[PDB]
Ligand SMILES: CC(=O)N[C@H]1[C@@H]2OC[C@@H](O2)[C@@H](O)[C@@H]1O[C@H](C)C(=O)N[C@@H](C)C(N)=O
């Protein structure tokens with residue numbers, strides 16, 4: 001029996017660290033922090049927030065949701081990025097996708113963060129309100145082609161890639177408040193479609209994040225809690241070797257019985273490496289208490305998500321910066 005490994009990613013209330021923020025960040029079972037709009041004012045201030053955090057924990061993973069389109073936390077002082085769907089609508093989509101990934105990842109690391117939780121490998125079936133323009137395409141193979149180019153872009157900029165939402169949010173409704181959404185199709189239907197982008201890119205992705213979706217013909221549990229999904233299918237059949245983040249263990253509408261302590265245990269037992277407790281500090285502290293009781297140690301592979309860029313004010317003098325700008329301005333994808 002495994003004396004398990006695992007880690008907690010949490011968040012803070014404001015634009016600078018309170019005393020409780022600093023004390024909770026000191027605990028080694030805490031491995032990450034994700035920022036949101038309420039933490040973000042101007043670029044100089046995000047850089048100071050990140051430096052503040054590194055003064056406490058030089059090893060912490062710092063994350064943000066910076067996709068483009070309708071999901072872009074870093075806005076003021078940043079290039080407004082296109083929705084994934086608009087990228088696909090060009091003759092030269094592959095080159096523009098690579099340019100977008102590179103530009104997003106260099107701007108994100110220029111303010112002190114390691115990673116963006118991107119790209120979305122979900123498929124636009126015109127069915128899930130949480131996908132929509134966040135997906136590249138509805139055709140599986142073209143979505144995998146354009147997302148693979150997006151990932152090449154992030155890598156050249158020095159940033160690890162997190163595909164989501166495994167094994168695909170496209171066919172199931174958009175996590176209503178009445179029930180966990182379901183994708184009722186057979187495993188072979190899913191393998192034939194929504195699983196394809198994850199299958200193509202399993203060798204290039206550094207990390208993955210599951211969908212909060214039950215696929216009852218495969219497992220009665222949401223994918224982020226299923227050993228069949230994460231172990232047998234993802235690590236076994238698709239030979240994925242990277243980091244597994246859980247979904248938001250404290251999300252509104254979760255429909256999971258048990259407090260955050262049993263959920264992070266469940267996430268870790270299923271095969272996740274790091275548990276996300278967003279927007280709920282009281283739950284974050286319960287999940288931390290739980291990791292302490294289990295004497296978890298950090299997953300070995302977690303340091304591979306650290307950014308290889310650095311905090312600077314320099315990148316705009318880099319040669320490639322101006323090509324990305326020109327190419328994307330030509331496609332009317334940015335201004
Ligand atoms: C910060 C915010 O407004 N929302 C956060 C909050 O934090 C984690 C969880 O909920 C996450 O699902 C969500 O972020 C996601 C990326 C989000 O904003 N999606 C919206 C745009 C949607 N439904 O299309």
Ligand SMILES: CC(=O)N[C@@H]1[C@@H](O)[C@H](O)[C@@H](CO)O[C@H]1O
Nearest residue numbers: 065117130164165169247248251
């Ligand atoms: C379907 C969906 O939007 N899932 C989001 C994911 O994109 C985001 O990276 C994460 C952290 O904020 O929170 C999840 O709830």
